[PDB]
Structure formats: structure tokens, C-alpha cells
Amino acid sequence: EAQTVISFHDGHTMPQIGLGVWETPPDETAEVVKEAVKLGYRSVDTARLYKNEEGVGKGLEDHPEIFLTTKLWNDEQGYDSTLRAYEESARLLRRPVLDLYLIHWPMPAQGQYVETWKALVELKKSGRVKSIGVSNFESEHLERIMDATGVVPVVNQIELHPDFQQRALREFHEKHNIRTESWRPLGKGRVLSDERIGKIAEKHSRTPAQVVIRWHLQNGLIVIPKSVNPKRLAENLDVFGFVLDADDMQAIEQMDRKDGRMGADPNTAKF
Incomplete structure (x- = not known):
């Protein structure tokens, strides 16, 4: 059972499952990253926001193979200021050339x-970077940056989980060959005790989390769950030995709610 990868329109390839080092203190970040690389994680995702790029960069010291993503935080937006921020991130991460660089929020x-x-x-x-993409862009923000440049992001990383499936944005993504990356893939945990999810999990001799991650995978999505517990890290990674069937996939499709969004709305987000 091999892990899967997703390829971009730009010809580059990214592991389909990664580690979102979001809630890790700068101090023990190096150690969390070394651990996950050991368990089999081939993609690490951070952001300037989390202030632990130095820890990630140390943790990946002898591991230039690991796919590495970081994001530009809001207060560094602007042409010259992004070029500096990217350089700074490259130095903190101890990787001269990053695999993926994202705009963290559009902030219209x-x-x-x-x-x-x-x-x-x-x-x-x-x-200076291999691939460029965005995070939290609505179709309208995407339209704008495409019209201004003629250059399509390879990826839009958005809140995406069974309660908020982002179907219309994914329809738009499809038309422009933009991959979808789910943040909040587990819905802050809401899904971990869902009965509908629970039945599918029994049927497959897997856990709720694993069923949900598989669901992201089978939808063609890049998935970066987070986890402190290396027990959940190993669990989250063990998702390439079963398949959700058509019934399973439809039953989860049906969980999609219009008030499913848990995090900030891109159009009204203010920090």
C-alpha cells in the first residue's frame, strides 16, 4: 500500500497527505517534525503566523526530500514586502527554494x-520557489489574480470538511485546474463522534478520523491534518489500506451544511 500524490498543472507533484504544524510551540516543533518524518510524513505545512519556521527548518535539517509549504501573513502583503518575507521564510526554514508558497488570506x-x-x-x-498558490481565496479573488497576471495558482487551501464541503468553489477550481487543499479536514473534531461517520468506521474497521481523511483523499483533495499525539499521527497516516464505496461517499456528501463553516469568512475576516 503506497501513499498517493497529487500533481499540479505546473508539472510539479505534492504528497496528498501532509502535516499541518499549526498548533505547535516553536520549542518542540523540530521534534514533532522529526517524529512525523519518521512515521512516514512526506509533506510539512506551516505559516509565518505560527512563528515556528525556525523549528520546522531545524526538524527537516537532513530531510530536503520532505515537501515544504509556507504562507505569507497578511501584514506583509505588497510586492516588495512579499519578496522579502519569502526570502526571510526561506532562511528560517533553511531551504533556499521552497516547494510551495501561499497567500494566507486574501484580505480584500x-x-x-x-x-x-x-x-x-x-x-x-x-x-526562487517551485510552486505558488493561495489560501482562503473565493472564486472572485481567484478570478481577479488570474485576470491581472495570466498565472493560475496550483492550489487553493481552504476550510473543508464533511460539514462544509466547498462544492461550488471546487467546481470553479476544476475549470481552472486548481487543486484543492483542505485545512480543518476534521472540522475541529466535530466529526470524530458523528454516528453516520461511526457506522462507516465500523464497516471498515477503521477510526472516524481515518474514514474522514480517506474521504478527502478519494475526492482528490490534498489533506493536511494536524496532530500533537504521535498516536494520532500514525493513525491519520494509515489510510491507504481501505476504500470507501459509493454508498459511503454519498452518505458523507449528504452531511454538507450551509452553516457548516467554522472558521473565518474570507470576505469578512479581520485580524
């Missing part, structure tokens, strides 16, 4: 996300 009220994207375009062209 700032007026800066198009110029930020043009900085990312330039980072791709100059060869």
Missing part, C-alpha cells in the same frame, strides 16, 4: 493581494 479590504500574487509570479519565474 487591504487592496494588496493582487500585488502579492505578482510577487509570487515573480518568485516562480525567477526560480
Whole structure:
């Protein structure tokens, strides 16, 4: 049973499951990363927001194979300011050339996300980063940066889980060959005790989390769950030895709620 990967339109390839090092203190981040690389994680995802890029970079010291993503935080948006921020991140992460760089939030009220994207375009062209994408962009924000540059992000990383399945945004993503990456894949844990999920989990001799991760996978989605517990890390990774059937997939499809969003709305988010 091999892990799966997802390929971008730009010809690059990313592991389909990664580690979201979001809630890890800077101090024990190196150690969490070394542990997950040991368990078999091939993709690590962080952000300037979490302030632990130095820890990630140390933890991946002798592991340049691990796919590495980081994001530009809101207050560093702007053309020159993104180019600096990217460089700084590259140094903190001890990787001269990053595998993926994302705009963390569009923040439409700032007026800066198009110029930020043009900085990312330039980072791709100059060869400073392999792939460029976005996080938390609505179709409209995507339309805008595509119209301004002619350059499509390879990935849009968005809140996505059984309660909020983001179908219309994924329809839009499809048309432009944009991969979907789910953050909040487990819905802050709400799903871990769902009966509908629980029955599917019994049927497959797997756990609720594993059923849910598999569901992301079978939908073609890049999935970065987070976990402190290396017991849950090993669990989350052990998802390539079963298959959800058509009944399973439809039953989860049916969980989608209009008020399923748990985190910030891209259009009204204010930090």
C-alpha cells in the first residue's frame, strides 16, 4: 500500500497527505517534525503566523526530500514586502527554494493581494520557489489574480470538511485546474463522534478520523491534518489500506451544511 500524490498543472507533484504544524510551540516543533518524518510524513505545512519556521527548518535539517509549504501573513502583503518575507521564510526554514508558497488570506479590504500574487509570479519565474498558490481565496479573488497576471495558482487551501464541503468553489477550481487543499479536514473534531461517520468506521474497521481523511483523499483533495499525539499521527497516516464505496461517499456528501463553516469568512475576516 503506497501513499498517493497529487500533481499540479505546473508539472510539479505534492504528497496528498501532509502535516499541518499549526498548533505547535516553536520549542518542540523540530521534534514533532522529526517524529512525523519518521512515521512516514512526506509533506510539512506551516505559516509565518505560527512563528515556528525556525523549528520546522531545524526538524527537516537532513530531510530536503520532505515537501515544504509556507504562507505569507497578511501584514506583509505588497510586492516588495512579499519578496522579502519569502526570502526571510526561506532562511528560517533553511531551504533556499521552497516547494510551495501561499497567500494566507486574501484580505480584500487591504487592496494588496493582487500585488502579492505578482510577487509570487515573480518568485516562480525567477526560480526562487517551485510552486505558488493561495489560501482562503473565493472564486472572485481567484478570478481577479488570474485576470491581472495570466498565472493560475496550483492550489487553493481552504476550510473543508464533511460539514462544509466547498462544492461550488471546487467546481470553479476544476475549470481552472486548481487543486484543492483542505485545512480543518476534521472540522475541529466535530466529526470524530458523528454516528453516520461511526457506522462507516465500523464497516471498515477503521477510526472516524481515518474514514474522514480517506474521504478527502478519494475526492482528490490534498489533506493536511494536524496532530500533537504521535498516536494520532500514525493513525491519520494509515489510510491507504481501505476504500470507501459509493454508498459511503454519498452518505458523507449528504452531511454538507450551509452553516457548516467554522472558521473565518474570507470576505469578512479581520485580524
